[PDB]
């Protein structure tokens, strides 16, 4: 597991597309919607299996003659020449959560809080924000609890970090302006119920110069393919979720001028490209031969 | 690359990817301000003035067609717009023109007709109108018939020309 120098690009990792696919199949077997409506319209009505998915971990291990490499440097931005490299038989256990604006029950960056983009400066691109210290989210339907206390300290690390990428600047947490309900709010899967939180409410903070109102919904859009999937209704009165947060998906406005003379950048949550969730766990891993 | 859309109407700008495959794509206006873009399957609206009445067609994306539709078009909406896919910049210029009659309805003889053309900030405007009659009067910036006629009732058509494209407004007439 000797020192060698190679470039890893998480943004072009060939496996995530595979891993993203493997997740789609895991889903076909586990949560089968009663109804899929797709574009004529191709549609089938079936009696549902009603089997919840309770996040079984998956290993994509390197096939025959192909090696999975890991990157050594302690903090690595998404695209970089990596100074030190090890080799591993298998990717580690991966818990696959299909999530938005939040990354769930995941992996934590150890010393520094790291922001990875195919381009960070890119005015357009999804931003991962891999985190050093984690937080707890518990929900009941009803309401969701995020500690009031955790946010002011976390305000600090971010106020400390962003400026360093974007110096002499002022920072906004603002709710998402438009788009679909899954993007608008935090989409996630707990126990065969799909959840949205108007977290528009949560980022209401601006910088330097707390309970979420979740909805339980049985008809939902699919991340998987374009369209709507319908899942049958709930047998029990009350449901428990404990989740831990390891991360974020983010975008900020830019706007490139117009005597706004704005000091500001506004970052709004984000998500919906499933492959990015898959990317935050898998960015270190790479598949090669010889 | 220029197309023209009538005021109050619905217009669509076209975007093409290299292979009939879904690609993350996103949309921008003359300032690098975001209208509409997508995440995989899901859709989102940019913080531009436009966001609502900014919407694109979903069905298309597997082919790799990622259109921008502005509907309930406004004059101020005319802009040069740029769609980004697989690191390509494709651009289209959109201008909005509107025609209007002097007043709402029921105009009778000796009375006079004025059509006015509102053109977006900074553009050339010339007008051709064929009367229901077909006598053709070329107003240019506004068209006036000083005194009105029997011949004149019914629906007649004006043409506005920019970037060598013509757009039709037809005005229904009661005399």
């Amino acid at each position, epitope marked *: 597991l000797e020192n060698v120098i190679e470039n890893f690009n998480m943004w072009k990792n060939d496996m995530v597309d595979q891993m993203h696919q493997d997740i789609i199949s895991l889903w076909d077997q586990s949560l089968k919607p009663c*109804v899929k409506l797709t574009p004529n319209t191709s*549609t089938i009505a079936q009696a549902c299996p009603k089997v919840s998915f309770d996040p079984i971990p998956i290993h994509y291990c390197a096939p025959a003659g192909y090696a999975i490499l890991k990157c050594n440097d302690k903090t690595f931005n998404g695209i970089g020449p990596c100074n030190n490299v090890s080799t591993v038989q298998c990717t580690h256990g991966i818990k696959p959560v299909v999530s938005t604006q939040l990354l769930l029950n995941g992996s934590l960056a150890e010393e520094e809080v790291v922001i990875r983009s195919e381009n960070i400066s890119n005015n357009v691109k999804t931003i991962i924000v891999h985190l050093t210290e984690s937080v707890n989210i518990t929900c009941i339907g009803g309401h969701c609890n995020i500690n009031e206390k955790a946010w002011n300290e976390t305000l600090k690390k971010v106020v400390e970090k962003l400026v360093k990428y974007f110096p002499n600047k002022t920072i906004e947490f603002a709710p998402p302006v438009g788009g679909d309900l899954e993007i608008t709010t935090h989409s996630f899967n707990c126990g065969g119920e799909f959840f949205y939180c108007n977290t528009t409410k949560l980022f209401n903070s601006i910088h330097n110069s707390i309970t979420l109102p979740c909805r339980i919904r049985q008809i939902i859009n699919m991340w998987q393919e374009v369209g709507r999937a319908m899942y049958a209704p709930p047998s029990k009165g009350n449901i428990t979720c404990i989740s831990d947060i390891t991360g974020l998906l983010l975008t900020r406005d830019g706007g490139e001028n117009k005597t706004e003379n704005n000091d500001t950048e506004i970052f709004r949550p984000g998500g919906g490209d499933m492959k990015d969730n898959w990317r935050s766990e898998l960015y270190k891993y790479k598949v090669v031969e010889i | 690359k220029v197309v023209l859309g009538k005021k109050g109407d619905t217009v669509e700008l076209t975007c093409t990817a290299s292979q009939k495959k879904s690609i993350q794509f996103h949309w921008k206006n003359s300032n690098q301000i975001k209208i509409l873009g997508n995440q995989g399957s899901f859709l989102t609206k940019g913080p531009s003035k436009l966001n609502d009445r900014a919407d694109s067609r979903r069905s298309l994306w597997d082919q790799g067609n990622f259109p921008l539709i502005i509907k309930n078009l406004k004059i101020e909406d005319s802009d040069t717009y740029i769609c980004e896919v697989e690191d390509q910049k494709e651009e289209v210029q959109l201008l909005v023109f509107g025609l209007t009659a002097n007043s709402d309805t029921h105009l009778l003889q000796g009375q006079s007709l004025t059509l006015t053309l509102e053109s977006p900030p900074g553009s050339s405007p010339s007008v051709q109108c064929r009367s229901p009659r077909g006598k053709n009067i070329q107003g240019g910036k506004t068209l006036s018939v000083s005194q009105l006629e029997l011949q004149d009732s019914g629906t007649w058509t004006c043409t506005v020309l920019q970037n060598q494209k013509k757009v039709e407004f037809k005005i229904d007439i009661v005399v």
Partner: antibody
Framework: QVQVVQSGAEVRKPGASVKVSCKVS????????IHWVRQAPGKGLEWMGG????????IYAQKFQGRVSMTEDTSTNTAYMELSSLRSEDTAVYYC??????????????????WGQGTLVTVSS | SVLTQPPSVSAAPGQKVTISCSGS????????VSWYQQLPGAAPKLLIF???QRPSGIPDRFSGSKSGTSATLAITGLQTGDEADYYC????????????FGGGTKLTVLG
């Protein structure tokens, strides 16, 4: 053929729920398919509810919010509507509406393509 | 939160006639307009959907248009048979409100 059938006309005492069936022949109801609309005698169309761009809801207009429940069973291929806590004004003709033979991924967008015969409810002292 | 159309309209048996409904960018500018024909004491039928699209079995006499924040229904060769009441439907984005109907108009042809 395509068909819509509504259940027989019915009479109610103020304060009692009413439940009205719909059966659809010629397609399998998507479950996003159906909107319930009723007409007062002598009056124009009033829309009670149906599915909307908010996913969890098949959504009901405000006048009807405390009291009304709408259903489609994708399997029996019929839809049921209950309006409860009845009023003098509620007598009207309740109509079952469906979209079809249209692409409704948009789902937000279908037209009300097939209409039922209409079914009548009158509420009285 | 409400559409308006006229309460009444009339015409000769040869003659063309139109019914116009107007709303707000909150309902109509944003969304599609479809039209419903209601015959004497019968369930309402979809005369028109998606602004200009006529469904099967409607004759070509019927037409539709949309522009600005109002939409227009057009009729030609009007028939004794065409007597009925017409309603304009638009799905609406703002507030809760959902699907909305204008009051509608009763059209009469003079026989």
């Amino acid at each position: 053929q395509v068909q819509v059938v509504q259940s027989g006309a019915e009479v109610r005492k103020p304060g009692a729920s009413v439940k009205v069936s719909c059966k659809v022949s010629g397609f399998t109801l998507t479950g996003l398919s159906i909107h319930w609309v009723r007409q007062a005698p002598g009056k124009g169309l009033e829309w009670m509810g149906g599915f909307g761009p908010e996913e969890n809801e098949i959504i009901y207009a405000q006048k009807f919010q405390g009291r009304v429940s709408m259903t489609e069973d994708t399997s029996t291929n019929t839809a049921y509507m209950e309006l409860s806590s009845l009023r003098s004004e509620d007598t009207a003709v309740y109509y079952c509406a469906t979209g079809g033979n249209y692409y409704n991924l948009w789902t937000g967008y279908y037209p009300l393509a097939y209409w039922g015969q209409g079914t009548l409810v009158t509420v009285s002292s | 939160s409400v559409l308006t159309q006229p309460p009444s309209v009339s015409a000769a048996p040869g003659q063309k006639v139109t019914i116009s409904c107007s709303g707000s960018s909150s309902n109509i500018g944003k969304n599609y307009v479809s039209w419903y024909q209601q015959l004497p004491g019968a369930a309402p039928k979809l005369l028109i959907f998606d602004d200009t699209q006529r469904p099967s079995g409607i004759p070509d006499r019927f037409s539709g248009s949309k522009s600005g924040t109002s939409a227009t229904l057009a009729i030609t060769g009007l028939q004794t048979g065409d007597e009925a009441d017409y309603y304009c439907g638009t799905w609406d984005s703002s507030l809760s409100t959902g699907q909305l109907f204008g009051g509608g108009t009763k059209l009469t042809v003079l026989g």
